[PDB]
Ligand binder design. Structure first.
Ligand SMILES: CCOC(=O)CNC(=O)N(Cc1ccc(N)cc1)Cc1nnn[nH]1
Length: 165
């Protein structure tokens, strides 16, 4: 009944930075929320632990989730390599929105982004499925290691992750 909560513990060149937690909107996008939850616990035998944020653009977003190729060309879902766009009920309203990255219609895998600005031009094209609950300050600290072209100045990793409650 209650929407699940997951955490990431973030590191910067291997040094601990802080924790970011997320509410997942399982009430509105159950299939998409479940994929992110299971990848965060690692319960299917694969997932986010140890992976990096490969593309960070200040004033736009932080992107990660490519645990197979580490550069934006890989990742896989708990349902197979790809799965469909579930719905577009929720919109990209401002900083803290959690949404699926993709390469065209019906190509969701594991890659995701955290908005650091309103990104309304993505509405109806990327599936919104959660939001930052605690640690937006940690996301803002991460964002400072990005650049205009998205290349990071230090390595930003998910040192640990899992489900709270
Ligand atoms: C704001 C979100 O924008 C997008 O999602 C656009 N595509 C995108 O960023 N991709 C391609 C991509 C994504 C998901 C999957 N599953 C496969 C490929 C990765 C990438 N990383 N660096 N350059 N491109």
């Amino acid at each position: 009944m209650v929407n699940p909560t997951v955490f990431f513990d973030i590191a910067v060149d291997g040094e601990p930075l802080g924790r970011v937690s997320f509410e997942l909107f399982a009430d509105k996008v159950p299939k998409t929320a479940e994929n992110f939850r299971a990848l965060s616990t690692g319960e299917k035998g694969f997932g986010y632990k140890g992976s990096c944020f490969h593309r960070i653009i200040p004033g736009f977003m932080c992107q990660g989730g490519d645990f197979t190729r580490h550069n934006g060309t890989g990742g896989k879902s708990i349902y197979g390599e790809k799965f469909e766009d579930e719905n577009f009920i929720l919109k990209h309203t401002g900083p803290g929105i959690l949404s699926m990255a993709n390469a065209g219609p019906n190509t969701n895998g594991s890659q995701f982004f955290i908005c650091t600005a309103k990104t309304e031009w993505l509405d109806g094209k990327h599936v919104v499925f959660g939001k930052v609950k605690e640690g937006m300050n940690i996301v803002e600290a991460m964002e400072r290691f990005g650049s205009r072209n998205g290349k990071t100045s230090k390595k930003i990793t998910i040192a640990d992750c899992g489900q709270l409650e």
